[PDB]
Every structure is written in structure tokens, then in C-alpha cells.
Design a protein around this ligand. Structure first.
Ligand code: GDP
Ligand code: GDP
Ligand code: MG
Ligand code: MG
Lengths: 177, 177
């Protein structure tokens, strides 16, 4: 709601910022966006089979799309992305190896070289959900000795961890550029 | 887009109406919605797990959501539904039986009792895509001895068939109550 509006209020200014939130399908990306209550989640299809949800807050645009189904059109988007958030279904032990692939494939893009990474280890409320330490390992985030990263455990449905992780991210951008 | 807006025009009274477009996931509902160019597709999540896309023209709300995976909140939506569009992935021969039960199930509900059913047999551009003739059977549309109904073969991505099926529906609604 507002606690999130406040967060991003310090990042306001004549400049179009982009915060990419990608992850596999059903990771909790649309739920996290609805939870921020920064505005209307509007869907558009840039290209057939390319669904993009966006919440435009002010100069800050929240762009979301599923991953693993790369793509050219993506680069255009990358050309504005200050920060990338990657949400993982901690309870989906089966597709984290994929999450890692795409993640590594995203970090490996030239325009996203100077982008702050925030990994949301969502669905923490599920009984056999990996913890933020398991996910950091499986994702091999400890080898990303090069970029400003961070992992916050969450539950998009109850909503906790979203503020704490977005607080970090907000701080980072505030002195990113 | 504009050809589509004029279609519903006559129906522009002050009356709050709703056209419910449903079917299994991946059927082509979001693509159909985007093709109409009647407005922005906003995703809301009334209850956890329940994602609804809505486009609003004037006194018209196109409410979309995936089925097959009733509920008390739908019945509330049902209590205002004039038209019911049911889109099927004509090429997904496997779950056609599932889209059949979900359809039948939806028609069982009382507020829907006076809803006009338009069936879009989508993805018609694919080689294996069942045709309206086979769909009309696999869904038992002929069993509907008590309601208005029409099946229109479409291809959402190119837009083929959208106007035809939607021109029919308009009439049904133009002389409803
Ligand atoms: N248990 C649990 N379920 C969640 C959580 N976040 C999202 N979900 C559920 O996972 C499904 C996928 O979520 P969704 O937001 O549509 O995913 P997206 O495909 O990544 O955009 C939905 O049915 C959610 O309501 C969470 O933290 N915990
Ligand atoms: N080949 C083909 N694909 C279609 C057609 N309509 C939709 N799709 C594709 O089917 C996938 C699912 O469609 P979508 O609009 O996302 O469906 P929804 O899950 O019902 O909202 C997307 O890749 C669409 O581009 C069609 O007529 N032909
Ligand atoms: Mg989604
Ligand atoms: Mg959809």
C-alpha cells in the first residue's frame, strides 16, 4: 500500500526507471505486484506469446513477465532496468535448477550488468519449502562475486518479507546511480 | 478494435452488464481480450489463487478467468452475467473433456440460467485443431435444449472469426430484457 509508496518516493525524479521482476511461471510474481498496491496491473502482449504485466508507479515502472517456456524484444526492456528482482518458488524443488539457468542467463546480458539483484525466496509458508540459505546455494548466488545482490525470504500471500526486501532494493537504487 | 467497439455500441444504456469469458488456461482468453482493443486489461486477485482480468468499455465489463483446476465469489459475478463466452483450445484434444465438464458445471448455476452462450473454437489455425463440428459434439452443445448458443471458429492471434461470433452475441444482448 502506502508503506511501499513511501519506499519508492525517494527514487522519484525526471528519469524513467524500470524494475524487472522475472521468475518461472507461478513463482508469485503477480501476487507480489498486486500486494504492493502501487497501481493497476495492466497486461499487454508485445509479441504473440509474450505476456508482460506492468505497474507504473511514477517514474518507476514495474515490468513482469514469466521466464522459461531468451528473447530479442527483452533487450529493449533491459535498456532501462536499474534493478532486477527474481522470485523463486522455494517449495518447487523441481524447477530451481531452471530458475538458476534463466537467472544466470539474465545476469549475462550486457545492459543488465549494472543492475541490482534482489532474489525473493517466496512461498516460505509451504511445509517443505527450501529456506533462503538453500536457495542461495542452489542458485549459486555466492559465486556472483561481481554484482550487488540480496535474498529476502517471503510469503507473497501473507505479504511479509516484501517490505524488508524492497527496503534494501530501494536503498540500493538510491545510491546505485 | 474500433470495429469491435461499435459492435457493442447499441448496448450502451446505463445498465451495468458483464460478459464472462472463461475456459481452461492457455485457451486464448487474454489474447482475445487484447485483440478487441476495447481498453486496458487489469489483473486483480479478489481472493488468493483467484486472478481475474477485466476490460471495461462503458457499461460493459469483460470479466475473464481460467476454470477447471464454481465457488461463492463467482456466483456473485454470475449475478450480473448477460453473456458467457467459452473459449476452447481446439488443438488441445486431451482436456476438451475437462472444458466440457467445466462448461456444463457453469451452466448448472441459476444466475447463469439466462446467459447467452457463445463458444469460440479457438486456435483454428493449427493443423490438428478440431473444427466447430467436432467441438460442438465433444462439448455436447446439442444437449442444450434450454439455451441460446453459437459456436464460432476463431484464431485469436490473427483475429479470424472474432467479429462473427461477437456480432451474433451482440444481437442476443440487443434484445435481452
Ligand atoms: N503458499 C503460497 N502461495 C503463494 C505465494 N505467492 C503466490 N502463491 C500462489 O502461487 C500461485 C502462482 O502465483 P502467481 O502470483 O499467479 O504467479 P506468477 O505466475 O509468477 O505471476 C497462486 O495461486 C498464488 O496465490 C506464497 O508466498 N505462498
Ligand atoms: N496458435 C494459436 N495460438 C493462440 C491462439 N489464440 C491464443 N493463442 C496462444 O495461446 C497461448 C495462450 O493464450 P492466452 O491468451 O495466453 O490464454 P489464456 O491462458 O486463456 O489467457 C499464447 O501463446 C497465445 O499467443 C490462436 O488462435 N492460435
Ligand atoms: Mg501471472
Ligand atoms: Mg490468461
Amino acid at each position: 500500500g502506502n508503506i511501499f509508496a513511501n519506499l519508492f518516493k525517494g527514487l522519484f525524479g525526471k528519469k524513467e526507471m524500470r524494475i524487472l521482476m522475472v521468475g518461472l511461471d507461478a513463482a508469485g510474481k503477480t501476487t507480489i505486484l498486486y500486494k504492493l498496491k502501487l497501481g493497476e496491473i495492466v497486461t499487454t502482449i508485445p509479441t504473440i506469446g509474450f505476456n508482460v504485466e506492468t505497474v507504473e508507479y511514477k517514474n518507476i515502472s514495474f515490468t513482469v513477465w514469466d521466464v522459461g517456456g531468451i528473447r530479442p524484444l527483452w533487450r529493449h526492456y533491459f535498456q532501462n532496468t536499474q534493478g532486477l528482482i527474481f522470485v523463486v518458488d522455494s517449495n518447487d524443488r523441481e524447477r530451481v535448477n531452471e530458475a538458476r539457468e534463466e537467472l544466470m542467463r539474465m545476469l549475462a546480458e550486457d545492459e543488465l550488468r549494472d543492475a541490482v539483484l534482489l532474489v525473493f525466496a517466496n512461498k516460505q509458508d509451504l511445509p517443505n519449502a527450501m529456506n533462503a540459505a538453500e536457495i542461495t546455494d542452489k542458485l549459486g548466488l555466492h559465486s556472483l562475486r561481481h554484482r550487488n545482490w540480496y535474498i529476502q525470504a517471503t510469503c507473497a500471500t501473507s505479504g511479509d518479507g516484501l517490505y524488508e526486501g524492497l527496503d534494501w532494493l530501494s536503498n540500493q537504487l538510491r545510491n546505485q546511480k
